[PDB]
Amino acid sequence: DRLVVQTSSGPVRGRSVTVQGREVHVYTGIPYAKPPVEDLRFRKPVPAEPWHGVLDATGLSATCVQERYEYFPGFSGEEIWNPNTNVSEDCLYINVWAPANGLPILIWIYGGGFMTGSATLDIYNADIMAAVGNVIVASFQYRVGAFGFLHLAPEMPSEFAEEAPGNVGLWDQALAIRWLKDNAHAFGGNPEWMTLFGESAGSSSVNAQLMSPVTRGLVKRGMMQSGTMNAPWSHMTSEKAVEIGKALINDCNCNASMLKTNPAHVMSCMRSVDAKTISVQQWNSYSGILSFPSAPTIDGAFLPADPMTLMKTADLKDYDILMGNVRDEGTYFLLYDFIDYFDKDDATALPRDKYLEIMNNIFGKATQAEREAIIFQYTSWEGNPGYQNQQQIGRAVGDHFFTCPTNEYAQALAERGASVHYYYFTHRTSTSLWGEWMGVLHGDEIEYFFGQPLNNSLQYRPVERELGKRMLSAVIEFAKTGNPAQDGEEWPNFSKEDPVYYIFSTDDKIEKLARGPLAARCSFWNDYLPKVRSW
Amino acid sequence: DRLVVQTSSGPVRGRSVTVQGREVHVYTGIPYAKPPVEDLRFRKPVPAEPWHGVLDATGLSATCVQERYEYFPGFSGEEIWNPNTNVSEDCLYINVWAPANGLPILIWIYGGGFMTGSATLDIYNADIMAAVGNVIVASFQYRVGAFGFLHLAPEMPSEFAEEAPGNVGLWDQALAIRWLKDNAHAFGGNPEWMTLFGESAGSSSVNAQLMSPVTRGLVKRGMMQSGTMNAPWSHMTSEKAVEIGKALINDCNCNASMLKTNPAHVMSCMRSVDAKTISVQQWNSYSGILSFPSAPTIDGAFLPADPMTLMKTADLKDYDILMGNVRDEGTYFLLYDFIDYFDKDDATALPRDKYLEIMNNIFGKATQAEREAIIFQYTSWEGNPGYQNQQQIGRAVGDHFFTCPTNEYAQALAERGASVHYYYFTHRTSTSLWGEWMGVLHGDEIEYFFGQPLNNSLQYRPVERELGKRMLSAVIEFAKTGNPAQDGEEWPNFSKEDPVYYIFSTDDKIEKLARGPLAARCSFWNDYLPKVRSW
Ligand SMILES: *[C@@H]1O[C@H](CO)[C@@H](OC2O[C@H](CO)[C@@H](O[C@H]3O[C@H](CO)[C@@H](O)[C@H](O[C@H]4O[C@H](CO)[C@@H](O)[C@H](O[C@H]5O[C@H](CO)[C@@H](O)[C@H](O)[C@@H]5O)[C@@H]4O)[C@@H]3O)[C@H](O)[C@H]2NC(C)=O)[C@H](O)[C@H]1NC(C)=O
Ligand SMILES: [Cl-]
Ligand SMILES: [Cl-]
């Protein structure tokens, strides 16, 4: 069977697909760890015991346990982020796309705030990327939610360290990535030619996999799409995670208080709560939009320090980073945690009642000083009263939570020596089923970097297919060379001294290279606001 | 002699001028007080003793004592603000323009920061205004500098109150204005139809004459051009003025310390210092650009409270105010107190070295909190690095010192009931001999409101003559009706609720009525910065 690869853990059988002239053998569902169930819930992953028969790697994996958004029933645009397959803890599986010293390897880490996401959503279909880019794309489920990130070792004696260390979702990724290096050659790939790439929490996970002392050196080439660990939603102190963790582990009626005189009876209890109940109970430590109960946790291990402290010493000499943002980052989340105020589909005339309403809630955790500074920075006199006030909050959240943290991380990375290219995705895809006011939603760049516009069975305007064509190629070229730039197309490095970024759109009369606008927007958050925080 | 008017103090003979079809009898040099010399230096004005023969009112008055700027030798544009006539304390004279129940009376108060200025500069020639507007224009010298504003009564016993009360320059104006009401009919005018109008400190002086309990009711119709008493350069506490005054009165080697055991030997000393030496010594208490040693002083008399406290109770029911600003207010003064950094004529690429340089000096008297807030509010990323940084300081000073104080005063006035119309002068006159980067200098609106474009012996573009035509007419129509608006031309009142302003320019494709831009610029100074001043 030419559709069989013998992996380090056994032969596997995949499917053949012919995309765009190339044949691709797509193997989905390869286990890379023991199903982290029963005893192994909350623990680091153990590698999968090898199998003998040819494993059926044609079915899609099961999706890691998570709840699913349905603030818009039926509305496809929401369910495309919801698990398309059965949800079970049995979810630690790999997917590998291999075309028919080895091809380059792109490993996809999905996003979803360490709380959601699956490698199997069709948005993540790597068929076109593998065929067109002639590269090996892999992906994999990692444990998300409390299943991946519950952290309680500080509250337990030393012997119980491996009971709930935290970050096992990242360890999962580490393991999956380690699995892929081992089996690179067996699928036709160069194990040293590996490239991580991901979006949001996936983008952040790429980040962690690149920086972590646990994994460092495994791969020094990463693409991060709107997700950096310095962002507030993408890192979390140990002591916070223990508070969240202690809440959940009696939110689940498991005591949580004897965690240190007789702990893992608390665990044994948490080992026998149904997953669905944790999958819903975890969210009650969520409020403060975009501060989820699970995050890369400073743990003395995978994340030994705060990300920016880690950056101070890291020397990223040989690292290639391709990172960026989409124009209207924060607008997907504004619609979600303030659906009370905003419409799915049409714009909102937001008043000033409702503007301070919303701004003051989002930022209550900050000084009145910087609260007022933010409110004034995102006041819009010249805009159509209302529409421009709604639109200015979507900027505020887009800026504070995504663009400006990754702008900051991008500058820190280049300072440490990494070769950083920055992109800004500003095209609204013609089939955006979201409200036009939300413009370029967070995640809208995914399908473009995967080359989905090239899918002639998907109605995209012609020059949108040329934007996919280009965006997909920048990812391939990056993976191949560390440099997303094309021939005769300039796209120089992004440094603090020259924070130039490429702009992907399909207006062919904008300046492709730009520096000013992003730097201005992020000067507020990254330079000025820190000064306001002086009491 | 048909060119003779018998005034309350004597017959006077003027000249006939035929301007634009009308004959105007222009009487310059009528005394309205005793020359405030010798004993009367620093004191309130006494009315002029009457004369018998027909007084020669054809010569121009002598200009009140003041020094003169010559940071640009020969360069006419500077000397046009310098005294065109002999400078002497003998300077308290009136000028009256009368065309051949009485015509309306416009009284012109010149500006110059209570430190400079003369009613006789040709810029202030009211020939065209009188003829075209068929109105009586009057003007008059008031004592400026230490001669008009030295304030020492608090430091003296009660008996010495009238020795140096402060504000005698304003009392001068009060007297001159009182003189003009008395002799209104004798020149062909309606004494009740009076209108004050002035520019900068003149604008502020109009303000004071309208609000002062001393003069209030005398005239309730005023035009204020870029000068309101709430502005920092236009009011000053008593205790500050005493410090300044005590400095000058031994800056002039007159002891200053025995001011309260045996004072007016200090005065007698100051009564015998040559005027020129005070005229130069007064300036050594000047530094901090646009905070002059003389200002309307809170004195318990002419200015009984801070201007904004006075506003809280004033009820301006029957007051008509026509006020406004020019586009680049602060740029004349930026060139002056920072000539080290900026060229007379061409723009300056200002660095960021030099940007914080300049901003930090201007505003040292403010918290680091608001210092930084200002620096960030006037940072320009998208502008041509340099030019836009120079240009952004000229805005900062234009805004803080003129536009936004008068914007604030304008709102306070309307709240108290005054009928306020607001204008914004944005045309750069084609013969601006200043650097193009300074755009619309402070004072550039004067010659336009006086109708000087109508002077066919002065080369102005055709539509600039239509801007003078219009600006002059708005002043006449205001004086006649309290409303600068024309027929079929909308120009509604300016209130805090609808801070709409008319825009004078000669691009006929701008929106004449506008609200947003000024309100945005002044929101910083008038709303946000006060909040930053909370420690
Ligand atoms: C371009 O755009 C197209 C339009 O959106 C898009 O379309 C479609 O292709 C997908 C996959 O090729 C179709 O998806 C399901 O429907 C198929 C038939 O309609 C199903 O057979 C299949 O289901 C099941 O197949 C999975 C394949 O990975 C697998 O998880 C399971 O089973 C399989 O394999 C074993 C052994 O080979 C068999 O025994 C099973 O029968 C099964 O085949 C699972 O049970 C597809 O998941 C979809 O319907 C197509 N149409 C539409 C409208 O979506 C393209 O994918 C886009 N991409 C490219 C590159 O063209
Ligand atoms: Cl080919
Ligand atoms: Cl006529």
Author numbering:
A (entry chain A), B (entry chain A): 3 to 102, 139 to 573
Paper's wording?
Acetylcholinesterase (AChE) terminates synaptic transmissions at cholinergic synapses by rapid hydrolysis of the neurotransmitter, acetylcholine. The first X-ray structure of an insect AChE was published almost 20 years ago, and was that of the fruit fly Drosophila melanogaster. However, the active-site gorge is much smaller, with a volume ca. 50% of that of the vertebrate AChEs, due to the presence of additional aromatic residues. Thus, we here present optimized structures of DmAChE in its native form and in complexes with ZA and ZAI.
Two datasets collected from a single crystal of native DmAChE (100 images at high resolution and 100 images at low resolution) were processed and merged using XDS. The resolution of the data improved from 2.7 to 2.45 Å, and the number of unique reflections increased by 33% without dramatic loss of completeness (98.8% to 95.3%) or I/σ ratio (5.8 to 3.3) in the highest-resolution shell. Surprisingly, the R-free value of the native enzyme increased from 0.270 to 0.295. However, as calculated by Phenix, the R-free is slightly smaller than the R-work in the original structure of the native enzyme, which is abnormal and suggests a bias. It is noteworthy that the original statistics reported by Harel et al., R-work = 0.258 and R-free = 0.301, are in better agreement with the statistics of the updated native DmAChE structure. The resolution improved from 2.7 to 2.5 Å, the number of unique reflections increased by 25% without any loss of completeness (98.7% to 98.4%), and with an acceptable loss in I/σ ratio in the highest-resolution shell (5.8 to 3.3). These statistics indicate a clear improvement of the overall data quality for both crystals, with more information available for the refinement of the models.
